[PDB]
Write a protein that binds this DNA or RNA. Structure first.
Ligand SMILES: [K+]
Ligand SMILES: [K+]
Ligand SMILES: [K+]
Ligand SMILES: [Mg+2]
Ligand SMILES: [Mg+2]
Ligand SMILES: [Mg+2]
Ligand SMILES: [Mg+2]
Length: 76
RNA sequence: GGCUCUGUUUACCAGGUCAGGUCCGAAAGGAAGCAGCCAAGGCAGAGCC
């Protein structure tokens, strides 16, 4: 069950992306990391400000996560 | 009802500490602040008033 914890560990095998991507996840709660679909507008705003990013950066991380979760489902 | 103890629970919506990330600064230095943790609140059991 590929989640943001798994993704975060993949980001830990950029700081031009990797450190910033890790930071966004580091502003999340464990429920958010476990079930990223619950992250809607208000949680995105909290995560963005808490990581010094914009909401569009959070959107981009979530999209990258989503693409990886789709690919892991299919490779498996 | 109050207080205490114990268990549990709680993204943000004036608490503390604030990793990471962020901001200001040439630096020296500063600042805001999410997660966690802590406090506190919620739900209960027990004890006391
Ligand atoms: K308690
Ligand atoms: K905090
Ligand atoms: K920090
Ligand atoms: Mg809080
Ligand atoms: Mg605070
Ligand atoms: Mg720091
Ligand atoms: Mg600078």
């Amino acid at each position: 069950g590929f989640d943001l914890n798994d993704f975060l560990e993949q980001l830990r095998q950029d700081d031009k992306v990797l450190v910033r991507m890790e930071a966004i996840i580091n502003s999340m709660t464990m429920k958010e990391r476990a079930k990223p679909e619950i992250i809607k507008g208000s949680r995105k705003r909290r995560i963005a400000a808490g990581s010094g990013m914009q909401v569009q950066d959070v959107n981009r991380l979530l999209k990258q996560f989503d693409d990886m979760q789709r690919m892991m489902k299919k490779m498996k």
